[PDB]
């Protein structure tokens, strides 16, 4: 998953 | 007697989109509102990742649909942002706050506006989204649509 | 500026160790953080990226960096069960008894999750078995509340 701007989105972003 | 780490396994299964695993974990007593250090729950993860079958499983076990993580994200924010219309529809039908604000002051309508999800904006408006709400950058959903030159979206928001 | 900070947070999240080294050479702040005080080391610990942790250490990262909620990277690694990261953080002097905003030390979190091998290493590096969180709970109390008899046996002797 691609990173997106937003609150804490890094923690929701893994793999593709 | 030796502990049960099912909460972590549910979070992992929801994030990975393992539909059958989620069912099995819930059928065996897994905490539907399990969370990690940042308050992120299986429903948050399913909502952001677009795993509709998992969302529905958690709804069978009385999940907190309005749970906020440490960043002010609700499941509706996350599904609206990443463009998961079907999840947005379901959450709204199950009583999720349509005008909840995250730590940036964004309502789900703001997030759908930023990403150009027209259908999601429409259903949010149908369920009473507040077109006057300003995030903490001072922007309404209409302002975001103009900043992004999205004519279709600006038309929807008048 | 903080453009490199954003880039370094993402390289740490993704486990791109070469990109971390490149960004440090570009002048990235090894302790860059987002608006929640979350640093590249936080993300590497959360994601289980042992190699990123090692690289940041060589570039002088602060292993006691605390986010808006009082989490150090040791909290994150201990809550998620990342033994190797817990060990390297302790070996580089991280505060084993650091407390988040609810008074939880890493020992508390590891106890909550039933991570026996992380409890062992935390104790080995001087974890405070008598420390109470803001609910009045020690790690031993948590293990009693959870019915984890293995964990209680370890802690009760102390």
Main attributes?
heterotrimer; A: 16 residues; little secondary structure; flat; B: 10 helices
Q: What is the CA-based Rg of chain A, rounded?
A: 7 Å
Category by helix and strand content of chain A: little secondary structure
Shape of chain B: elongated
Measured by DSSP, the beta-strand proportion of chain B falls in: under 5%
Distance between the termini of chain B: 60 Å
Largest protein interface? B-C, 12 and 20 residues
Shape, per Cα inertia axes of chain A: flat
The major beta sheet of chain A can be summarized as: none
Helix content of chain A: under 10%
Order of H and E elements of chain B:
HHHHHHHHHH
Give the CA-CA distance, first to last residue of chain A: 4 Å
Number of helical regions of chain A: 0
DSSP helix count of chain B? 10
How many strands appear in the DSSP assignment of chain B?
0
* Approximate strand percentage of chain A: under 5%
Count of separate structural domains of chain B: 1
Could you characterize the architecture of this molecule?
The complex is a heterotrimer, with one copy of chain A (16 residues) and two copies of chain B (158 residues). By secondary structure, chain A is low in regular secondary structure. Helix content of chain A is 0%, strand content 0%. Chain A contains no helices and no strands. Chain A is flat, with a radius of gyration of 7 Å. The termini of chain A are close together. In chain A, 38% of the residues are buried. By secondary structure, chain B is an all-alpha fold. Chain B has one domain. Chain B has helices at 6-16, 19-27, 42-49, 52-60, 75-81, 85-93, 108-115, 118-126, 141-147, 151-156. In chain B, helix 1 (6-16) runs parallel beside helix 3 (42-49), helix 5 (75-81) runs parallel beside helix 7 (108-115) and helix 7 (108-115) packs parallel to helix 9. The chains are: A little secondary structure (16), B mainly alpha (158). Chain B binds chain C through residues 1-5, 8, 36-38, 70-71, 103, and chain C through 35-36, 46, 68-69, 71, 75-76, 79-81, 109, 113-114, 146-151.
């Amino acid at each position: 998953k691609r990173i997106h701007i937003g609150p804490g989105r890094a923690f929701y972003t893994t793999x593709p | 007697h030796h502990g049960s780490d099912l909460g972590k396994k549910l979070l992992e299964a929801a994030r990975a989109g393992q539909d059958d695993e989620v069912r099995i974990l819930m059928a065996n007593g897994a905490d539907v509102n399990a969370n990690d250090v940042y308050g992120i729950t299986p429903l948050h993860l399913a909502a952001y990742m677009g795993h509709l079958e998992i969302v529905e499983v958690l709804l069978k076990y009385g999940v907190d649909v309005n749970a906020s993580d440490q960043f002010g994200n609700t499941p509706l924010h996350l599904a609206a942002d990443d463009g998961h219309l079907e999840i947005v529809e379901v959450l709204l039908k199950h009583g999720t706050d349509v005008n909840a604000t995250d730590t940036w002051g964004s309502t789900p309508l703001h997030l759908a506006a930023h990403r150009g999800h027209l259908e999601i904006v429409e259903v949010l408006l149908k369920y009473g989204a507040d077109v006057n709400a300003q995030d903490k950058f001072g922007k309404t959903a209409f302002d975001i649509s103009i900043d992004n030159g999205n004519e279709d979206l600006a038309e929807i928001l008048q």
